[PDB]
Tab-separated table of C-alpha atoms and ligand atoms in Angstrom:
chain	number	residue	atom	x	y	z
A	1	UNK	CA	0.000	0.000	0.000
A	2	UNK	CA	1.855	3.043	-1.381
A	3	UNK	CA	2.551	5.738	1.228
A	4	UNK	CA	4.056	9.228	0.829
A	5	UNK	CA	6.329	8.727	3.846
A	6	UNK	CA	7.557	5.271	2.868
A	7	UNK	CA	11.098	6.633	3.283
A	8	UNK	CA	10.630	8.884	6.336
A	9	UNK	CA	13.279	6.831	8.185
A	10	UNK	CA	14.875	4.955	5.272
A	11	UNK	CA	15.895	7.939	3.121
A	12	UNK	CA	15.222	11.124	5.189
A	13	UNK	CA	16.261	13.709	2.617
A	14	UNK	CA	15.228	11.846	-0.518
A	15	UNK	CA	13.219	14.699	-2.034
A	16	UNK	CA	15.822	17.408	-1.389
A	17	UNK	CA	18.433	15.355	-3.284
A	18	UNK	CA	16.434	14.631	-6.439
A	19	UNK	CA	14.981	18.174	-6.428
A	20	UNK	CA	18.493	19.587	-6.524
A	21	UNK	CA	19.535	17.311	-9.372
A	22	UNK	CA	16.625	18.224	-11.655
A	23	UNK	CA	17.069	21.927	-10.807
A	24	UNK	CA	20.746	22.117	-11.882
A	25	UNK	CA	20.003	19.988	-14.946
A	26	UNK	CA	17.751	22.816	-16.105
A	27	UNK	CA	20.377	25.560	-15.956
A	28	UNK	CA	21.180	24.471	-19.502
A	29	UNK	CA	17.985	22.699	-20.623
A	30	UNK	CA	14.538	24.297	-20.099
A	31	UNK	CA	12.931	21.134	-21.449
A	32	UNK	CA	14.208	18.386	-19.176
A	33	UNK	CA	11.144	18.890	-16.980
A	34	UNK	CA	8.578	18.061	-19.658
A	35	UNK	CA	10.825	15.239	-20.878
A	36	UNK	CA	10.970	13.624	-17.422
A	37	UNK	CA	7.183	13.748	-16.935
A	38	UNK	CA	6.346	12.118	-20.283
A	39	UNK	CA	8.905	9.469	-19.294
A	40	UNK	CA	6.859	8.494	-16.213
A	41	UNK	CA	3.862	8.284	-18.546
A	42	UNK	CA	5.490	5.807	-20.914
A	43	UNK	CA	6.436	3.626	-18.006
A	44	UNK	CA	3.005	3.205	-16.432
A	45	UNK	CA	1.076	2.347	-19.634
A	46	UNK	CA	3.321	-0.678	-20.403
A	47	UNK	CA	3.474	-3.556	-17.899
A	48	UNK	CA	2.936	-0.956	-15.150
A	49	UNK	CA	4.769	1.900	-13.427
A	50	UNK	CA	7.764	-0.418	-12.796
A	51	UNK	CA	10.674	1.302	-14.525
A	52	UNK	CA	10.612	-1.491	-17.128
A	53	UNK	CA	11.172	1.151	-19.819
A	54	UNK	CA	14.626	2.215	-18.613
A	55	UNK	CA	16.128	-1.229	-19.290
A	56	UNK	CA	18.653	-1.400	-22.173
A	57	UNK	CA	19.251	-4.195	-24.668
A	58	UNK	CA	20.666	-7.438	-23.239
A	59	UNK	CA	21.140	-10.979	-24.528
A	60	UNK	CA	18.091	-11.567	-22.379
A	61	UNK	CA	16.042	-8.356	-22.909
A	62	UNK	CA	14.725	-6.457	-25.972
A	63	UNK	CA	14.256	-2.827	-24.842
A	64	UNK	CA	10.916	-1.029	-25.189
A	65	UNK	CA	13.089	1.949	-26.154
A	66	UNK	CA	12.928	0.521	-29.684
A	67	UNK	CA	9.152	0.387	-30.029
A	68	UNK	CA	7.452	2.639	-32.580
A	69	UNK	CA	6.393	5.315	-30.038
A	70	UNK	CA	9.729	5.298	-28.137
A	71	UNK	CA	12.303	5.151	-30.924
A	72	UNK	CA	13.951	8.503	-31.691
A	73	UNK	CA	11.517	10.245	-29.333
A	74	UNK	CA	11.818	9.841	-25.524
A	75	UNK	CA	14.880	11.381	-23.792
A	76	UNK	CA	16.576	12.105	-20.475
A	77	UNK	CA	17.555	8.645	-19.230
A	78	UNK	CA	20.906	10.335	-18.616
A	79	UNK	CA	19.625	12.862	-16.094
A	80	UNK	CA	17.647	9.936	-14.675
A	81	UNK	CA	20.820	7.991	-13.870
A	82	UNK	CA	22.432	11.066	-12.260
A	83	UNK	CA	19.559	11.085	-9.783
A	84	UNK	CA	20.092	7.401	-8.912
A	85	UNK	CA	23.839	7.963	-8.433
A	86	UNK	CA	23.314	10.854	-5.996
A	87	UNK	CA	20.481	9.081	-4.145
A	88	UNK	CA	22.672	5.956	-3.738
A	89	UNK	CA	25.502	8.003	-2.228
A	90	UNK	CA	23.044	8.663	0.603
A	91	UNK	CA	20.627	5.720	0.789
A	92	UNK	CA	22.639	2.696	-0.464
A	93	UNK	CA	20.269	0.433	-2.432
A	94	UNK	CA	16.942	1.408	-0.804
A	95	UNK	CA	15.095	3.652	-3.307
A	96	UNK	CA	13.729	2.239	-6.594
A	97	UNK	CA	14.062	3.655	-10.092
A	98	UNK	CA	10.298	3.316	-10.551
A	99	UNK	CA	9.623	5.737	-7.701
A	100	UNK	CA	12.290	8.154	-8.949
A	101	UNK	CA	10.366	8.651	-12.198
A	102	UNK	CA	7.163	9.347	-10.255
A	103	UNK	CA	8.908	11.934	-8.086
A	104	UNK	CA	10.413	13.604	-11.150
A	105	UNK	CA	7.011	14.172	-12.787
A	106	UNK	CA	5.654	15.994	-9.713
A	107	UNK	CA	8.816	18.078	-9.263
A	108	UNK	CA	8.668	19.001	-12.971
A	109	UNK	CA	5.186	20.522	-12.519
A	110	UNK	CA	6.210	22.532	-9.469
A	111	UNK	CA	9.379	23.666	-11.222
A	112	UNK	CA	7.300	24.950	-14.145
A	113	UNK	CA	4.671	26.928	-12.268
A	114	UNK	CA	2.168	24.075	-12.039
A	115	UNK	CA	0.635	22.564	-8.832
A	116	UNK	CA	2.221	20.117	-6.396
A	117	UNK	CA	1.018	17.109	-4.365
A	118	UNK	CA	2.254	14.424	-1.883
A	119	UNK	CA	3.662	11.574	-3.940
A	120	UNK	CA	2.746	8.112	-2.605
A	121	UNK	CA	5.842	5.929	-2.745
A	122	UNK	CA	7.043	2.365	-2.220
A	123	UNK	CA	7.003	0.692	-5.663
A	124	UNK	CA	9.600	-1.884	-6.728
A	125	UNK	CA	11.480	-2.381	-10.027
A	126	UNK	CA	10.752	-5.171	-12.532
A	127	UNK	CA	12.914	-7.892	-14.073
A	128	UNK	CA	11.372	-7.929	-17.555
A	129	UNK	CA	10.310	-5.710	-20.433
A	130	UNK	CA	7.734	-5.856	-23.242
A	131	UNK	CA	8.426	-4.171	-26.567
A	132	UNK	CA	5.365	-5.420	-28.490
A	133	UNK	CA	3.121	-4.439	-25.598
A	134	UNK	CA	4.583	-0.936	-25.868
A	135	UNK	CA	3.401	-0.663	-29.497
A	136	UNK	CA	-0.091	-1.805	-28.632
A	137	UNK	CA	-0.581	0.259	-25.465
A	138	UNK	CA	0.610	3.821	-26.134
A	139	UNK	CA	-1.884	5.968	-28.104
A	140	UNK	CA	-0.821	7.447	-31.441
A	141	UNK	CA	-1.544	11.058	-32.532
A	142	UNK	CA	-3.581	9.999	-35.593
A	143	UNK	CA	-6.155	8.326	-33.346
A	144	UNK	CA	-9.743	9.541	-33.304
A	145	UNK	CA	-11.654	10.293	-30.080
A	146	UNK	CA	-13.219	6.836	-29.936
A	147	UNK	CA	-9.782	5.248	-30.200
A	148	UNK	CA	-8.216	7.528	-27.609
A	149	UNK	CA	-10.955	6.829	-25.041
A	150	UNK	CA	-10.543	3.077	-25.532
A	151	UNK	CA	-6.787	3.198	-25.003
A	152	UNK	CA	-7.245	4.951	-21.670
A	153	UNK	CA	-9.913	2.459	-20.592
A	154	UNK	CA	-7.441	-0.414	-20.955
A	155	UNK	CA	-5.455	1.353	-18.213
A	156	UNK	CA	-8.460	1.985	-16.011
A	157	UNK	CA	-8.729	5.709	-16.782
A	158	UNK	CA	-11.912	7.546	-17.781
A	159	UNK	CA	-12.932	10.309	-20.147
A	160	UNK	CA	-12.216	13.035	-17.585
A	161	UNK	CA	-8.853	11.404	-16.929
A	162	UNK	CA	-8.091	11.535	-20.670
A	163	UNK	CA	-8.853	15.251	-21.153
A	164	UNK	CA	-7.087	16.097	-17.876
A	165	UNK	CA	-3.723	14.469	-18.607
A	166	UNK	CA	-3.654	15.947	-22.142
A	167	UNK	CA	-2.852	19.159	-20.310
A	168	UNK	CA	0.647	17.747	-20.038
A	169	UNK	CA	0.998	19.179	-23.540
A	170	UNK	CA	0.963	22.674	-22.068
A	171	UNK	CA	4.769	22.481	-22.452
A	172	UNK	CA	7.434	20.417	-24.262
A	173	UNK	CA	8.342	19.670	-27.901
A	174	UNK	CA	7.168	17.614	-30.936
A	175	UNK	CA	8.744	16.879	-34.354
A	176	UNK	CA	7.205	18.006	-37.670
A	177	UNK	CA	6.363	14.486	-38.865
A	178	UNK	CA	4.025	13.931	-35.915
A	179	UNK	CA	1.531	16.468	-37.282
A	180	UNK	CA	2.631	17.383	-40.797
A	181	UNK	CA	-0.139	15.284	-42.383
A	182	UNK	CA	-2.628	18.057	-41.549
A	183	UNK	CA	-0.479	20.773	-43.169
A	184	UNK	CA	-0.755	19.721	-46.843
A	185	UNK	CA	-2.683	16.486	-47.502
A	186	UNK	CA	-5.236	15.453	-44.852
A	187	UNK	CA	-7.332	12.296	-45.498
A	188	UNK	CA	-6.017	12.150	-49.079
A	189	UNK	CA	-8.110	15.285	-49.753
A	190	UNK	CA	-5.111	17.300	-50.911
A	191	UNK	CA	-6.127	20.013	-48.439
A	192	UNK	CA	-5.131	20.993	-44.842
A	193	UNK	CA	-7.139	19.744	-41.859
A	194	UNK	CA	-10.137	22.136	-41.724
A	195	UNK	CA	-9.811	22.338	-37.930
A	196	UNK	CA	-6.404	24.039	-37.817
A	197	UNK	CA	-6.141	27.833	-37.441
A	198	UNK	CA	-5.210	29.317	-40.835
A	199	UNK	CA	-2.744	31.809	-39.370
A	200	UNK	CA	-0.966	29.086	-37.418
A	201	UNK	CA	-1.233	26.917	-40.563
A	202	UNK	CA	1.221	29.346	-42.147
A	203	UNK	CA	3.744	29.715	-39.351
A	204	UNK	CA	3.739	25.909	-39.276
A	205	UNK	CA	4.269	25.419	-43.035
A	206	UNK	CA	7.243	27.706	-42.475
A	207	UNK	CA	8.876	25.555	-39.782
A	208	UNK	CA	7.832	22.369	-41.614
A	209	UNK	CA	8.308	22.575	-45.450
A	210	UNK	CA	6.778	19.951	-47.722
A	211	UNK	CA	10.215	18.309	-47.811
A	212	UNK	CA	13.347	19.460	-46.009
A	213	UNK	CA	16.522	17.907	-44.666
A	214	UNK	CA	14.942	16.644	-41.458
A	215	UNK	CA	12.563	16.882	-38.524
A	216	UNK	CA	12.447	20.325	-36.967
A	217	UNK	CA	11.098	20.990	-33.492
A	218	UNK	CA	8.147	23.177	-32.516
A	219	UNK	CA	6.362	23.991	-29.217
A	220	UNK	CA	3.207	22.117	-28.223
A	221	UNK	CA	1.948	25.352	-26.647
A	222	UNK	CA	2.465	28.488	-28.766
A	223	UNK	CA	1.249	30.608	-25.855
A	224	UNK	CA	3.437	29.635	-22.887
A	225	UNK	CA	5.977	27.105	-24.339
A	226	UNK	CA	7.691	26.307	-21.033
A	227	UNK	CA	5.159	27.209	-18.351
A	228	UNK	CA	2.653	24.769	-16.855
A	229	UNK	CA	-0.736	26.506	-17.173
A	230	UNK	CA	-4.239	26.097	-18.609
A	231	UNK	CA	-3.224	27.870	-21.852
A	232	UNK	CA	-3.349	24.522	-23.680
A	233	UNK	CA	-7.142	24.512	-23.281
A	234	UNK	CA	-7.522	28.112	-24.378
A	235	UNK	CA	-5.635	27.337	-27.591
A	236	UNK	CA	-8.205	24.677	-28.508
A	237	UNK	CA	-10.947	27.313	-28.433
A	238	UNK	CA	-9.076	29.238	-31.130
A	239	UNK	CA	-8.163	26.082	-33.087
A	240	UNK	CA	-4.482	26.361	-32.122
A	241	UNK	CA	-4.051	22.780	-30.926
A	242	UNK	CA	-0.841	21.375	-32.457
A	243	UNK	CA	-1.516	17.641	-32.537
A	244	UNK	CA	-4.506	15.989	-34.185
A	245	UNK	CA	-5.488	14.234	-30.942
A	246	UNK	CA	-5.362	17.569	-29.075
A	247	UNK	CA	-7.895	19.479	-31.189
A	248	UNK	CA	-10.250	16.480	-31.431
A	249	UNK	CA	-11.135	17.092	-27.769
A	250	UNK	CA	-12.956	20.262	-28.827
A	251	UNK	CA	-13.601	19.974	-32.577
A	252	UNK	CA	-15.399	16.602	-32.563
A	253	UNK	CA	-19.078	17.392	-33.296
A	254	UNK	CA	-21.118	15.715	-30.577
A	255	UNK	CA	-18.330	15.973	-28.023
A	256	UNK	CA	-18.816	14.829	-24.427
A	257	UNK	CA	-15.387	16.263	-23.661
A	258	UNK	CA	-16.219	19.781	-24.932
A	259	UNK	CA	-17.882	20.963	-21.724
A	260	UNK	CA	-14.770	19.761	-19.834
A	261	UNK	CA	-12.377	21.657	-22.132
A	262	UNK	CA	-14.535	24.737	-21.645
A	263	UNK	CA	-14.677	24.232	-17.892
A	264	UNK	CA	-10.891	24.041	-17.663
A	265	UNK	CA	-9.999	26.910	-20.000
A	266	UNK	CA	-12.144	29.073	-17.697
A	267	UNK	CA	-10.887	28.229	-14.216
A	268	UNK	CA	-7.203	27.278	-14.146
A	269	UNK	CA	-7.405	26.355	-10.495
A	270	UNK	CA	-10.133	23.897	-11.432
A	271	UNK	CA	-7.874	22.365	-14.045
A	272	UNK	CA	-4.989	22.269	-11.565
A	273	UNK	CA	-6.956	20.234	-9.047
A	274	UNK	CA	-8.171	17.483	-11.341
A	275	UNK	CA	-4.555	17.067	-12.413
A	276	UNK	CA	-3.148	16.309	-8.965
A	277	UNK	CA	-5.863	13.651	-8.729
A	278	UNK	CA	-5.309	12.160	-12.204
A	279	UNK	CA	-1.528	11.909	-11.787
A	280	UNK	CA	-1.931	9.898	-8.581
A	281	UNK	CA	-4.378	7.518	-10.246
A	282	UNK	CA	-1.962	6.919	-13.133
A	283	UNK	CA	0.929	6.346	-10.726
A	284	UNK	CA	-0.934	3.326	-9.373
A	285	UNK	CA	-1.142	1.200	-12.548
A	286	UNK	CA	0.283	-2.336	-12.349
A	287	UNK	CA	2.429	-1.524	-9.306
A	288	UNK	CA	4.848	-3.995	-7.608
A	289	UNK	CA	4.947	-3.789	-3.808
A	290	UNK	CA	6.017	-5.565	-0.621
A	291	UNK	CA	8.518	-8.227	-1.689
A	292	UNK	CA	7.661	-8.231	-5.406
A	293	UNK	CA	10.355	-7.348	-7.911
A	294	UNK	CA	13.583	-5.784	-6.657
A	295	UNK	CA	15.587	-2.593	-6.064
A	296	UNK	CA	17.700	-1.992	-9.162
A	297	UNK	CA	21.211	-0.701	-8.409
A	298	UNK	CA	21.616	0.682	-11.935
A	299	UNK	CA	18.440	1.732	-13.771
A	300	UNK	CA	19.547	0.551	-17.253
A	301	UNK	CA	20.298	-3.111	-16.315
A	302	UNK	CA	18.771	-5.779	-14.046
A	303	UNK	CA	20.768	-6.725	-10.943
A	304	UNK	CA	23.579	-8.856	-12.361
B	401	LIG	C1	-3.503	11.003	-24.754
B	401	LIG	C2	-2.474	10.614	-25.700
B	401	LIG	C3	-1.244	11.232	-25.966
B	401	LIG	C4	-0.712	11.311	-27.234
B	401	LIG	C5	-1.431	10.878	-28.521
B	401	LIG	C6	0.631	11.921	-27.090
B	401	LIG	C7	1.479	12.187	-28.165
B	401	LIG	C8	2.698	12.874	-28.070
B	401	LIG	C9	3.623	13.079	-29.227
B	401	LIG	C10	3.401	12.562	-30.660
B	401	LIG	C11	4.696	13.824	-28.781
B	401	LIG	C12	5.702	14.632	-29.660
B	401	LIG	C13	6.418	14.200	-30.961
B	401	LIG	C14	7.863	13.740	-30.740
B	401	LIG	O1	8.625	14.459	-30.061
B	401	LIG	O2	8.248	12.666	-31.252
B	401	LIG	C15	4.436	14.013	-27.304
B	401	LIG	C16	5.229	14.821	-26.472
B	401	LIG	C17	4.930	15.100	-25.132
B	401	LIG	N1	3.851	14.537	-24.407
B	401	LIG	FE1	2.369	13.425	-25.082
B	401	LIG	N2	0.904	12.298	-25.754
B	401	LIG	C18	-0.229	11.822	-25.047
B	401	LIG	C19	-0.383	11.934	-23.673
B	401	LIG	C20	0.519	12.556	-22.830
B	401	LIG	C21	0.423	12.478	-21.379
B	401	LIG	C22	-0.617	11.710	-20.566
B	401	LIG	C23	1.487	13.174	-20.885
B	401	LIG	C24	1.863	13.270	-19.542
B	401	LIG	C25	0.961	13.684	-18.460
B	401	LIG	C26	2.209	13.729	-22.049
B	401	LIG	C27	3.309	14.600	-21.974
B	401	LIG	C28	4.078	14.989	-23.085
B	401	LIG	C29	5.228	15.885	-23.036
B	401	LIG	C30	5.712	16.661	-21.819
B	401	LIG	C31	5.769	15.922	-24.290
B	401	LIG	C32	7.092	16.561	-24.732
B	401	LIG	C33	8.292	16.065	-23.930
B	401	LIG	C34	9.611	16.551	-24.489
B	401	LIG	O3	9.696	17.743	-24.844
B	401	LIG	O4	10.561	15.744	-24.562
B	401	LIG	N3	1.656	13.257	-23.256
B	401	LIG	N4	3.195	13.429	-26.876
B	402	LIG	CA1	6.743	0.039	-17.518
B	403	LIG	CA1	1.764	26.395	-20.970
């Protein structure tokens, strides 16, 4: 039974240590926060929030890091190991990698202006990984509302939960290819997605030609690119949602989620509160406790 003081005696100043690490790691990278959060997300949806995603390729394991949604996309496993190293120098093999990811996501929010909350801890690391599962569990951006809702149900999350965690896109980056299909030829129609702001449609065609020498980066939130706030929901009202799965929350005739987007864009505090709740719920998926699993000494390889 996960408890926020699971380390009260075991690792007294756990939080202070990891907080410091993530803070210095931002002196040169104002994106590591968003990167760390999304990392905790990709862990939970596959096999459970058990760090299974941080495992590298072995003669015995085929890393999830090579699945369609992970390859050439997720980042920051480096800053992740720096945390482990510093935590170990204080609490020799007592804190799990799994928990470290969960603590990073909360700290990231606080460090970006967003809300905070007491993180329940006590999970244990796994001994396996599942690449194929990864491909069939993480939602893709070209999914329609029906599809998105179903993917969250598999995890035990509802419609509110879906629209609430999408707020994570209030900061961070995304490569051209992930949304370019709605810039020139949507649905084989030869024309741009009719639900994308025309002004933005230009700025975007600028950053993402119809053929260049590679994938350029662009902010998920044109309003407040690095700050955690309800701007992401406001943007939807003016058709400025970057990804296809973002806009669909508001521009899907019929809706169900529309009143919720409206609700949030109005009262940021309201949005903030559902979040704290939703993040806790997600951090409880397929957890390993008590004597299950182990305490990894190095987050990239299993003990031995
Ligand atoms: C509901 C389905 C979701 C879809 C379809 C989705 C899709 C994406 C895609 C395609 C990218 C960017 C393209 C790339 O860089 O390769 C991305 C980035 C991001 N997503 Fe999501 N995402 C989803 C849910 C979430 C959730 C639940 C969170 C966390 C609460 C989240 C947090 C982020 C962050 C912070 C980034 C950028 C991180 C960075 O800059 O490295 N996403 N997402
Ligand atoms: Ca996992
Ligand atoms: Ca923002």
